[PDB]
Amino acid sequence: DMKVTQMPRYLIKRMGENVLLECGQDMSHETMYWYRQDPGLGLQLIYISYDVDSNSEGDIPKGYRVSRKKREHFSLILDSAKTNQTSVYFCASSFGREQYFGPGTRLTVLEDLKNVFPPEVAVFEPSEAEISHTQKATLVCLATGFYPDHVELSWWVNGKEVHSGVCTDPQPLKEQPALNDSRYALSSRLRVSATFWQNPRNHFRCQVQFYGLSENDEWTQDRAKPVTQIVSAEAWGRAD
Amino acid sequence: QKTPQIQVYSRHPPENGKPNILNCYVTQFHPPHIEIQMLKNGKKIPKVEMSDMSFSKDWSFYILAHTEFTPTETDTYACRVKHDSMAEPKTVYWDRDM
Amino acid sequence: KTTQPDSMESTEGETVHLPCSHATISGNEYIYWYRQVPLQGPEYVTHGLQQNTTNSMAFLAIASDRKSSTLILPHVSLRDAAVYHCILSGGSNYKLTFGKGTLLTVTPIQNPDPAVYQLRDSKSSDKSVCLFTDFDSQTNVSSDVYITDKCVLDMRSMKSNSAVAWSNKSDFACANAFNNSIIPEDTFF
Amino acid sequence: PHSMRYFETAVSRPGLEEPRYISVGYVDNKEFVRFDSDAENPRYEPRAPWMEQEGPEYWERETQKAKGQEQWFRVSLRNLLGYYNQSAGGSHTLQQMSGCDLGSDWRLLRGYLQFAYEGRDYIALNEDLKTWTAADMAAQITRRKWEQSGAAEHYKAYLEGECVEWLHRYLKNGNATLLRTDSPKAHVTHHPRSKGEVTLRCWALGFYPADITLTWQLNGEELTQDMELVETRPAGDGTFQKWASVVVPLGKEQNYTCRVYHEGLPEPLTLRWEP
Amino acid sequence: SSLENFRAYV
């Protein structure tokens, strides 16, 4: 009923490039918004369109421009991208009551794409102990070494996505806090009744999609170009 | 839409020979956009001021159109209103008695 | 503008109170409450001018003669943990300025039961991983070690706490993290 | 008795793309301010003499609120096109009346807020400042929106609060102009029409305000079921004028009396036909 | 001071 969506959810771009984030509502609300919030502070207003070609600045106008040619849409333009413009962007709309926010777009403006990496992934089988101590079995996935934090980790049992008994880290931790462009890591647990893991027919797969580069992204390095992909790790049940 | 109720008259009693002001009071009309003209012997009188647009409680608009003139027993003045609600200009001739 | 406490502690069940001092109010301006769960973007909760509004979720209570207000959250759950914002929105203005609101943490329950297990990867190799579980309500986690914050998972069936740790060195195992510190000291190799 | 009004008008125009917003404010039926987009430097101007004193921190204040209204109508005007499926680039009118009435006691008596589209009524704020009245099916769209958006509260907070609070202030000064008045100067005229019949027109010039009354009579008995009367017209000099007439047989002139009732008059003006 | 209509348009 009241949904607001933004395309390119994740997006990486090199400094100086043209960024274009989109946002649609399909409910023709008169007024829409562009917000950004960095892990540090909170939400700051960039631009607000009251209706089509009626657009007003806001709090952080410098570095951005907007385009409202239809009620339903509202695009955000970064002519010359900037490193510090690497925040999270939220689009919104209202008709008079409250504002209806989107899902958020994660934009990373890198000075050098050589810092980009896909994640190495591996699953860890349950500890022989826990199965006899608490009668349950916990599997652990570990997405290691990747940048930036454009990852979504999911569990798949026998082919079905499972959010039942799953827990994933909220904030990916840095494997080296010192470095300014610290490479990231992540983990997630999947607890299942010990009896379940005791059957070598079940298929446990820890999937983690990366949102890296794409077509027009020029890449020179010898290592395969780190583009959007689905690195995974599997593990069969054990009756042993 | 409401047809403009027109009323042509003078500010002070008609003293043919002594200066005066001819008024054209248009009321009860809608939409706002209206074309009003003052006439003398069948010609468009130049320099004709107009009251600022303003409407009454019933949404109807009203405006006053005035210009300097000097009445004579030969000069037949009139007011001509062209409005969205009328087929074509509504001519209302002056009458000193009214 | 407004003002709210940075933090706010709570537990699975307790009914939460969220203050919001806001004097110098135009009276022409409403008061809105937004909730922003980490990751997600802000979503609307409730608003009011005077009196005491309310929704299917929370109760809004505006103090007599304004100047302050309070949001009430009934029998809260884990999913009710986020950052609640209190903004003043003029009835004739679409602009509303977010502060940093109030980070509401909600601790579950169930009895703790420290364990700490060690696991290897299905592709049986050298890499090992330690698993700290069930340290309910105990902040700590204090080289080349990697330790993640406590992750609360709600098993649909039968609670349950956990955290992961490793250090790459295929040789050692729980060598640093966990060292004559907390826990019964009696782990499981 | 003591009331303040704000009449607003936004008019779409062919090709012009941008409508013409005109806000006129009344105090006791007396214009005292006015905004108009078309103007050289669009902003509020004091239409009354007692407003000249208001500080610039008030004029820069209003104009900024006016500019705000202007856009509201601009958007509201496009919405209507949708409702009635009217095509863009054309002349359409959206009006609004709002204000507060005071009783003998300077406490608020009644609140006023009503919109009109294309001359017709659209939606209005009821006498209770809580509910809405929707004329046609389209307005029921606007109402439902304004209901679920808690629109009423905002307007009530004004009518009762800010509105009244400022009318008082406008009366702390206005009570030196909207009190003085000009008096009528009646005089019957004699015009002949048809054989043995003459019309007797009772004029009344130079009065202020426009509220007045003219009466004809026969031998003393009230006459009105036969008289011809013209609406009050503005002289153009700040004052007004009006007249009534009667058709009567020749040689029966002196039989008729013409009484004139006006605010600024100590006693009715009885008139008659002279030589 | 004049009225400042509610944010919600027609």
Side-chain angles (χ1 to χ4, degrees), chain A residues 127-137 194, chain C residues 117 188:
Chain A
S127 182
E128 183 64 62
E130 177 174 335
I131 82 172
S132 60
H133 190 158
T134 195
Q135 292 287 261
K136 294 187 181 65
Chain C
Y117 305 97
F188 290 92

Short mmCIF file of all heavy atoms in Angstrom, two decimals, chain A residues 127-137 194, chain C residues 117 188:
data_model
loop_
_atom_site.label_atom_id
_atom_site.label_comp_id
_atom_site.label_asym_id
_atom_site.label_seq_id
_atom_site.Cartn_x
_atom_site.Cartn_y
_atom_site.Cartn_z
N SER A 127 30.26 -28.09 16.83
CA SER A 127 31.20 -28.69 17.76
C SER A 127 30.62 -29.98 18.33
O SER A 127 29.49 -30.00 18.81
CB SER A 127 31.54 -27.72 18.89
OG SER A 127 32.49 -28.28 19.78
N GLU A 128 31.41 -31.05 18.27
CA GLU A 128 30.98 -32.35 18.76
C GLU A 128 30.44 -32.26 20.18
O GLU A 128 29.59 -33.06 20.58
CB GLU A 128 32.14 -33.35 18.70
CG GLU A 128 31.77 -34.76 19.12
CD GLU A 128 30.77 -35.40 18.19
OE1 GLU A 128 31.08 -35.57 17.00
OE2 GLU A 128 29.65 -35.72 18.65
N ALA A 129 30.93 -31.28 20.93
CA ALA A 129 30.54 -31.11 22.33
C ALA A 129 29.11 -30.62 22.48
O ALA A 129 28.29 -31.27 23.13
CB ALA A 129 31.51 -30.16 23.03
N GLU A 130 28.81 -29.47 21.88
CA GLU A 130 27.50 -28.83 22.04
C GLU A 130 26.32 -29.76 21.78
O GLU A 130 25.25 -29.60 22.37
CB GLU A 130 27.40 -27.59 21.15
CG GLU A 130 26.04 -26.90 21.21
CD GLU A 130 26.00 -25.60 20.43
OE1 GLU A 130 27.07 -24.98 20.25
OE2 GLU A 130 24.90 -25.19 20.01
N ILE A 131 26.51 -30.74 20.90
CA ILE A 131 25.43 -31.65 20.54
C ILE A 131 25.05 -32.57 21.71
O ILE A 131 23.92 -33.06 21.78
CB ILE A 131 25.78 -32.51 19.31
CG1 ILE A 131 26.65 -33.70 19.70
CG2 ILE A 131 26.47 -31.66 18.25
CD1 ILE A 131 26.88 -34.69 18.57
N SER A 132 26.00 -32.79 22.62
CA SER A 132 25.77 -33.66 23.76
C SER A 132 25.60 -32.86 25.05
O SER A 132 25.23 -33.41 26.09
CB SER A 132 26.92 -34.66 23.91
OG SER A 132 28.15 -34.00 24.10
N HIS A 133 25.88 -31.56 24.98
CA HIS A 133 25.80 -30.70 26.15
C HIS A 133 24.44 -30.00 26.22
O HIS A 133 23.79 -29.99 27.27
CB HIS A 133 26.94 -29.68 26.15
CG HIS A 133 27.07 -28.90 27.42
ND1 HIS A 133 28.24 -28.28 27.80
CD2 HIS A 133 26.17 -28.65 28.41
CE1 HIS A 133 28.06 -27.67 28.96
NE2 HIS A 133 26.82 -27.88 29.35
N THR A 134 24.02 -29.40 25.11
CA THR A 134 22.77 -28.66 25.07
C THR A 134 21.77 -29.26 24.09
O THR A 134 20.69 -28.71 23.87
CB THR A 134 23.00 -27.18 24.72
OG1 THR A 134 21.82 -26.42 25.03
CG2 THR A 134 23.32 -27.02 23.24
N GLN A 135 22.13 -30.39 23.49
CA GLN A 135 21.24 -31.12 22.59
C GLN A 135 20.97 -30.38 21.28
O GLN A 135 20.09 -30.76 20.52
CB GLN A 135 19.92 -31.43 23.29
CG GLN A 135 20.02 -32.45 24.42
CD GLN A 135 20.26 -33.86 23.91
OE1 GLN A 135 19.32 -34.66 23.81
NE2 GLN A 135 21.51 -34.18 23.58
N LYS A 136 21.73 -29.32 21.02
CA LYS A 136 21.57 -28.55 19.79
C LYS A 136 22.88 -28.44 19.02
O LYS A 136 23.95 -28.72 19.56
CB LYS A 136 21.00 -27.16 20.09
CG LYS A 136 19.59 -27.17 20.65
CD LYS A 136 19.03 -25.76 20.77
CE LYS A 136 17.62 -25.76 21.33
NZ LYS A 136 17.58 -26.24 22.74
N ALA A 137 22.79 -28.03 17.76
CA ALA A 137 23.97 -27.90 16.91
C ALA A 137 24.01 -26.56 16.19
O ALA A 137 23.06 -26.17 15.51
CB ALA A 137 24.02 -29.04 15.90
N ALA A 194 20.08 -30.88 17.37
CA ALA A 194 21.17 -31.82 17.11
C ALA A 194 20.74 -33.00 16.25
O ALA A 194 21.48 -33.46 15.38
CB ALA A 194 21.77 -32.31 18.43
N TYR C 117 32.60 -23.23 22.48
CA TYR C 117 32.95 -24.41 21.69
C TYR C 117 33.93 -24.07 20.58
O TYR C 117 34.01 -22.93 20.14
CB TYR C 117 31.69 -25.04 21.09
CG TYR C 117 30.63 -25.40 22.11
CD1 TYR C 117 29.56 -24.54 22.34
CD2 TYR C 117 30.68 -26.59 22.81
CE1 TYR C 117 28.58 -24.86 23.26
CE2 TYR C 117 29.71 -26.91 23.74
CZ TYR C 117 28.66 -26.05 23.96
OH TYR C 117 27.68 -26.37 24.87
N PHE C 188 35.88 -26.11 26.23
CA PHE C 188 35.83 -27.41 25.58
C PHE C 188 36.74 -27.44 24.36
O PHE C 188 36.45 -26.82 23.34
CB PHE C 188 34.40 -27.76 25.18
CG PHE C 188 33.49 -28.06 26.34
CD1 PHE C 188 32.74 -27.05 26.92
CD2 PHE C 188 33.39 -29.35 26.84
CE1 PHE C 188 31.90 -27.33 27.99
CE2 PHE C 188 32.55 -29.62 27.91
CZ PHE C 188 31.81 -28.61 28.48
#
